[PDB]
Enzyme design. Sequence first.
Site, PDB file in Angstrom:
ATOM      1  N   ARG C  30       0.803  -1.229   0.000  1.00  0.00           N
ATOM      2  CA  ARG C  30       0.000   0.000   0.000  1.00  0.00           C
ATOM      3  C   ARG C  30       0.834   1.277   0.000  1.00  0.00           C
ATOM      4  O   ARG C  30       0.349   2.320  -0.430  1.00  0.00           O
ATOM      5  CB  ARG C  30      -1.036   0.021   1.139  1.00  0.00           C
ATOM      6  CG  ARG C  30      -2.136   1.105   0.951  1.00  0.00           C
ATOM      7  CD  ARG C  30      -3.229   1.000   2.020  1.00  0.00           C
ATOM      8  NE  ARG C  30      -3.615  -0.399   2.183  1.00  0.00           N
ATOM      9  CZ  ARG C  30      -3.798  -1.008   3.350  1.00  0.00           C
ATOM     10  NH1 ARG C  30      -3.650  -0.339   4.494  1.00  0.00           N
ATOM     11  NH2 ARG C  30      -4.103  -2.311   3.369  1.00  0.00           N
ATOM     12  N   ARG C  48      12.658  -5.551   6.470  1.00  0.00           N
ATOM     13  CA  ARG C  48      11.636  -6.350   7.145  1.00  0.00           C
ATOM     14  C   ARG C  48      10.268  -5.957   6.560  1.00  0.00           C
ATOM     15  O   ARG C  48      10.109  -5.928   5.323  1.00  0.00           O
ATOM     16  CB  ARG C  48      11.737  -6.138   8.680  1.00  0.00           C
ATOM     17  CG  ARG C  48      12.952  -6.849   9.342  1.00  0.00           C
ATOM     18  CD  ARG C  48      13.107  -6.425  10.823  1.00  0.00           C
ATOM     19  NE  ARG C  48      14.100  -7.190  11.587  1.00  0.00           N
ATOM     20  CZ  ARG C  48      13.869  -8.375  12.157  1.00  0.00           C
ATOM     21  NH1 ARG C  48      12.707  -9.012  11.979  1.00  0.00           N
ATOM     22  NH2 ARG C  48      14.832  -8.967  12.850  1.00  0.00           N
ATOM     23  N   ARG C  91      -2.917   6.362  10.831  1.00  0.00           N
ATOM     24  CA  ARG C  91      -3.036   5.026  10.283  1.00  0.00           C
ATOM     25  C   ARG C  91      -4.173   4.962   9.266  1.00  0.00           C
ATOM     26  O   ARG C  91      -5.346   5.211   9.611  1.00  0.00           O
ATOM     27  CB  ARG C  91      -3.236   3.988  11.389  1.00  0.00           C
ATOM     28  CG  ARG C  91      -3.639   2.613  10.838  1.00  0.00           C
ATOM     29  CD  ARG C  91      -3.546   1.456  11.855  1.00  0.00           C
ATOM     30  NE  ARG C  91      -4.530   0.423  11.490  1.00  0.00           N
ATOM     31  CZ  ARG C  91      -4.406  -0.414  10.466  1.00  0.00           C
ATOM     32  NH1 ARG C  91      -3.335  -0.364   9.688  1.00  0.00           N
ATOM     33  NH2 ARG C  91      -5.382  -1.281  10.196  1.00  0.00           N
ATOM     34  N   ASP C 208     -13.350  -4.451   4.829  1.00  0.00           N
ATOM     35  CA  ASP C 208     -13.150  -5.563   3.894  1.00  0.00           C
ATOM     36  C   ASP C 208     -14.060  -6.773   4.132  1.00  0.00           C
ATOM     37  O   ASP C 208     -13.946  -7.793   3.449  1.00  0.00           O
ATOM     38  CB  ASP C 208     -11.667  -5.996   3.831  1.00  0.00           C
ATOM     39  CG  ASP C 208     -11.134  -6.573   5.141  1.00  0.00           C
ATOM     40  OD1 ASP C 208     -11.904  -6.829   6.111  1.00  0.00           O
ATOM     41  OD2 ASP C 208      -9.895  -6.776   5.176  1.00  0.00           O
TER      42      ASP C 208
END
Lengths: 248, 248, 248, 248, 248, 248
Positions: C30, C48, C91, C208
């Site tokens: 994303r 990572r 976020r 979702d």
Amino acid sequence: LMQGMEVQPHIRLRKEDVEPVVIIVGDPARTEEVANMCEKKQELAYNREYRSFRVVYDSQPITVISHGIGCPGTSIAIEELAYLGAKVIIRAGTCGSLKPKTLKQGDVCVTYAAVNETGLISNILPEGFPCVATPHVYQALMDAAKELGIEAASGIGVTQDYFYQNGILPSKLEMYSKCCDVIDMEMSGVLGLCQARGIATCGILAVDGSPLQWDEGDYDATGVKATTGKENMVKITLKACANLRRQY
Amino acid sequence: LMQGMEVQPHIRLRKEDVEPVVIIVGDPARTEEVANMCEKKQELAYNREYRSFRVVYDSQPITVISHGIGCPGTSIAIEELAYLGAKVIIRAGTCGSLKPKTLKQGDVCVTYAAVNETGLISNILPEGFPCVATPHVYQALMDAAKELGIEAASGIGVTQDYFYQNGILPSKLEMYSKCCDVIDMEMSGVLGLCQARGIATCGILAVDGSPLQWDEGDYDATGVKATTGKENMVKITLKACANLRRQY
Amino acid sequence: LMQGMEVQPHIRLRKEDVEPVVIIVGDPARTEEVANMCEKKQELAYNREYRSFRVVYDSQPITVISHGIGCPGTSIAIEELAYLGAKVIIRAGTCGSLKPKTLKQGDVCVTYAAVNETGLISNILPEGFPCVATPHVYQALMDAAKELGIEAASGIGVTQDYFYQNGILPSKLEMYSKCCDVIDMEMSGVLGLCQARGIATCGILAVDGSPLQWDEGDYDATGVKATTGKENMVKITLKACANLRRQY
Amino acid sequence: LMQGMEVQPHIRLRKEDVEPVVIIVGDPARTEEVANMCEKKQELAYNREYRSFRVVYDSQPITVISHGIGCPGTSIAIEELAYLGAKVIIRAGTCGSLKPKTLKQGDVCVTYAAVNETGLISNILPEGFPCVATPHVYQALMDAAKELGIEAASGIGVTQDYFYQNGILPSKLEMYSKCCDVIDMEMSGVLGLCQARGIATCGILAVDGSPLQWDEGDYDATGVKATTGKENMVKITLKACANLRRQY
Amino acid sequence: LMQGMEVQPHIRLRKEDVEPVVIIVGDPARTEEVANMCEKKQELAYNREYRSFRVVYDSQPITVISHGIGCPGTSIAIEELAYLGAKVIIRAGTCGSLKPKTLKQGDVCVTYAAVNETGLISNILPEGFPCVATPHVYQALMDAAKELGIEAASGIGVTQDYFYQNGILPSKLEMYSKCCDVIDMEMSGVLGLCQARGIATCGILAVDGSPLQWDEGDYDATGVKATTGKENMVKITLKACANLRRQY
Amino acid sequence: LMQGMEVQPHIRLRKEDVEPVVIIVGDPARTEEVANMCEKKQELAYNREYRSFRVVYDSQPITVISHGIGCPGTSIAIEELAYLGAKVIIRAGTCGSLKPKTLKQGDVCVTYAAVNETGLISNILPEGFPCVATPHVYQALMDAAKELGIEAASGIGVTQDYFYQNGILPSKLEMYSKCCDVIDMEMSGVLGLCQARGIATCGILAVDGSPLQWDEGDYDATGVKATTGKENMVKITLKACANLRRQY
Ligand SMILES: O=c1[nH]cnc2c([C@@H]3N[C@H](CO)[C@@H](O)[C@H]3O)c[nH]c12
Ligand SMILES: O=c1[nH]cnc2c([C@@H]3N[C@H](CO)[C@@H](O)[C@H]3O)c[nH]c12
Ligand SMILES: O=c1[nH]cnc2c([C@@H]3N[C@H](CO)[C@@H](O)[C@H]3O)c[nH]c12
Ligand SMILES: O=c1[nH]cnc2c([C@@H]3N[C@H](CO)[C@@H](O)[C@H]3O)c[nH]c12
Ligand SMILES: O=c1[nH]cnc2c([C@@H]3N[C@H](CO)[C@@H](O)[C@H]3O)c[nH]c12
Ligand SMILES: O=c1[nH]cnc2c([C@@H]3N[C@H](CO)[C@@H](O)[C@H]3O)c[nH]c12
């Protein structure tokens, strides 16, 4: 200036009375049963619920002592034994099965860990501390069982501060049965406190019933099945302990 | 009527992509490092933090997949691996030492248990549940180490849901150091969740520093000591996993 | 004498790589999707699960970085970003709906607070600490949505340290549905830790599926509805972040 | 067959006595002080610690009622107000400062959230539930303050079930001061319970001292500074409430 | 169809062996000491840590039985005694003093309540349940003491699941000393469980030292002071129990 | 240098206004009802929910003061009364029955203990602290009831920080009914805090309904049954308090 006590106040032993390998059992009567399977025995003390012997098995001297029912009384024996130089402590006890299909009266289970529900471990160790056996001690018990041709399950137990399941609050046994094998009243305390004191440790338990089926009469601690299971457990424990004792 | 998904949604694998023995590592980059030590390698998928290979070591096919930092991301990998047929899961990770006198950068520690401080285990399992390794899996790791002549400590870890110890509330590390050997961010979650799903499990960890001494610069994850420690850990893990894989 | 690290160890950024306004997303993929909606982009690092870009939107430079699934991995990104001078962290993630009647796949929800079930917040902040958005950051997101003509719910979420609801212990989702709107795995950690570090913060989430209805197949993270919701969320976030960025 | 009570048993009001917008204050005496700032006032009832008025401010009718000290007495008022049709509840109270350098006697703080230490919220809502304000209600208070030219801090409070800090157990105030701005005895209960009952909510508080400095005499609830602070708070609250009331 | 057991499995008594009034003591040896103070005595059973007598004092028959160290072993005795018809249970035990200035070796304390730190009570009763004596039983003990001219303190104890205070976690005794007079290992479990089973109950305790001063040698369980204290306690208990027994 | 306040800030009393024996009641209106049963009365102060009188009963001067609904407001009155020299505090309040078969509207219950569900006691005292009455104060109440020929139950109560049982979370009243007799909102706070402050204490409560049967209309606080119960309770309390007052 302070001095140590000659004899520890509850178990009433001195350091010369305690071997680096110790078998602990809940019932004072079982200390004698263990002793009677050995080449030599000597009763040392009997105070309160703490009866002790020095025994000789396979030429190795081992301490055998009762701890009474429950973690609190057991914590005293373990602390006093540890002060006197105990290095390995194995609990050889009895238990209920939470897997009544595959663990039944007479069966033996080597417990490498236990779910803690005791106030002892909740207060002396941080939250989330694993009450777990020392790997080489578990291995000695399993290797003894294999050598002797005696079937021994390997399992995780749960330990509670009570026996009867009488309810203001809902019983937790159904849930526990979904993640462990056996139930008793001392194992997590023994494993946890031994780990905390740097004592190598494991547990082995003989099944006397299933509390999920007590209502259907699945309990017989005095019966031949339970009696034979306990005999088998003692044979494994004594073999394993003589092997461990040699290393000291 | 419902149907299963063809590929699991996060790890993006199908059942034919998953072996009964799985090595999980935190860092996507380490999956390739593992694969480069094998006879044969095949990269399968790489979605989010989940990078997967099938590897062949000593003629045995084994899955290698990254789980990302922390129990929550790890829980997804384990659940989806379990749905796909994983029977054995070993975490080969890095950790901090809480015993800086004896466990130093480059050292390897096989963790047979871990103190749980994770929200994962606190919410999916009853209070007091031991986050513990399956004995025969621990034994396979230690036996592999002995065979290779590589020193491996045996210890209890602690697992936290954070890395940095910046405080509004006091750090617990000094207390943990009294009863634990190493610290990481996934072990209790791996051991506990695998136990709950009936997956055989253990952990092995290479030391990259000591958080008790971070203030004096005791951290070097990329340094030669840590890099060698991880290589040794992987050698032990691959050897143990080939042996385990043979039993399926 | 000690010195700081040149590059933070996990996100692998230096202070010149980090803007005072940061968008964080769970999925490394994303970060590029966000970058592709901007006038200028520059990928900075990828270590990572932490992939980072500097982007320019409406002439304002903004940091975009992935945090991986779950609070623990996210705590590392936030601590390292905060050390490098981050002042606003939003976020932009995905979530399940706990109100399947009115929040459905494709819908966007600005979360001004979240119920905490994470081990992170339970251990780093006092009990009862509210994981809450900074009012002016929430307002910037809502004002952006209004300006763009994009519908955005305003809600309280719940954050857990796991995705799958597989049970030794009873699922809590039915209860949670009676007091909050959406469910994810990082929000309370982000809001709480940002508040603790004095970083202005808010969350925005694209639906979702609904875990209350997963058994009926209500999940489609790759589908057009979810894909469009995420696009809408990104449009709101980028608009709001350029406005906030101007103040620095 | 059962029927509802004509008047609610504690607050002694009927539905025609309650407006959709309600100002709640701790002290019965403050209800009259509020009412004296309005165009029109009517005292409705006074039972136990619950004294109520209907007031008209900027042509809008608003309920004003006292809740008494502490969450439990307050819970009764809110439950009975909610049964009677309250849609918006704002607590206009007093508090201590945990930021004595910047928030002093006479200062006003709009609390958009509060750390919960109350038994009320711990027992009626899940652990980790955020005691948080409804964004549009917070915005109405801040916009009213801006319009009036009255400075108002925006902050997070902490709520305790006690006032005095006499200890058998250590005081937590120093810790709270690291992450909170103000302290009172009802806010988290108001915000949390209103959220649970779907009532839009916020808090505003006038500082009367600093408990971190009570030992040096930093307390003056009746003094001119505190009296002016409360007057300012009431001006802001009445203005915001008239605006909110118009939407019903 | 099921039937009850003829003798209860741990205490090995039948209903005809159990009086409605029971004195319980920790040590098997003390049951005989009690019995030696009576007109008539009959030893009934001795299994594990459970040794029992019927005694006749002031023409009243009373059961005397040992419970062993700690709440868990004690819970078994109480449950089995209750099944057999016990209506009144008084624990006559030993304890440590947390008030070393006023309560010293040889002193007796009637405990009308106890702070619970046991896992037993934490799991079988709701949080916050008071482990408290039945008023008329407390009154019988105090009235007996007054009649005999033997000084008896009236106090609140604390009960722990351990004896030794060796720490990984800090000792709580200094804190307990601010709000408690004495410390033992069974009292809260006795009082709490008897309350739950509708058994009238109280405790009386003879001081054998002070754990706050164990480091300076303040412990002498076998000494003349402690021995005299226990004798006084038994005199009070037997007198109170004969009076209680008469009402049945 | 610091000085004490002339008048305590909430109850607005000076030391000459406070007797060593205090009756506390929740409702300001009840202070006058008590006063009207005495030979002499003098209203002292009325601030917030704290209305106070000096009364003379049986030639003994006693303080009577309201504490408001709930532990928090009550904690303030008790702390301020204790600072002013209060030595005995008895709560004479109202309550619900959890034993609707045998405790009904109009009945009186002397509560010698209470199950704590309050945030007050959970935060100011260690976990497991018993909220219990002082034995001689309980005895004075019972001896007064006996002398007057007024029936008074002896019971354990439960105290909650709320009245209404409206559910996100399950009600606990059914469970509580299996181990206690009555329910109110202040008792454990009063008993616990008084014990903590070394104030002798007990509670007495008149039943106004049963919350287990509120759905069937079992509530009538204003009715003749409740009114008579309260009158009886006051007669007992005043008699007991004059007797206690004499000792000072
Ligand atoms: O079914 C059971 N539940 C709990 N404990 C035990 C025991 C063990 N034996 C003793 C109780 O009989 C006690 O020490 C406990 O650890 C045997 N069976 C059971
Ligand atoms: O000193 C440490 N403290 C906590 N975690 C880790 C780790 C492990 N590696 C990752 C953090 O670098 C994370 O997966 C954690 O489990 C290495 N060293 C340390
Ligand atoms: O239905 C859900 N339950 C919990 N988490 C998530 C998510 C979020 N996306 C990731 C899991 O796919 C994880 O970061 C979580 O925060 C999407 N949907 C759901
Ligand atoms: O310094 C303080 N600490 C705690 N509460 C308060 C208050 C508030 N006012 C009342 C106590 O005076 C109570 O309702 C509390 O919420 C003012 N100042 C302080
Ligand atoms: O100082 C002490 N601390 C804790 N327990 C006890 C006891 C009691 N006696 C046994 C321990 O000696 C045990 O039953 C405990 O309840 C006497 N003294 C003390
Ligand atoms: O049925 C009840 N449940 C809880 N509290 C109370 C009360 C007491 N009276 C007040 C509530 O009316 C409050 O002080 C509480 O302690 C009477 N009845 C009940």
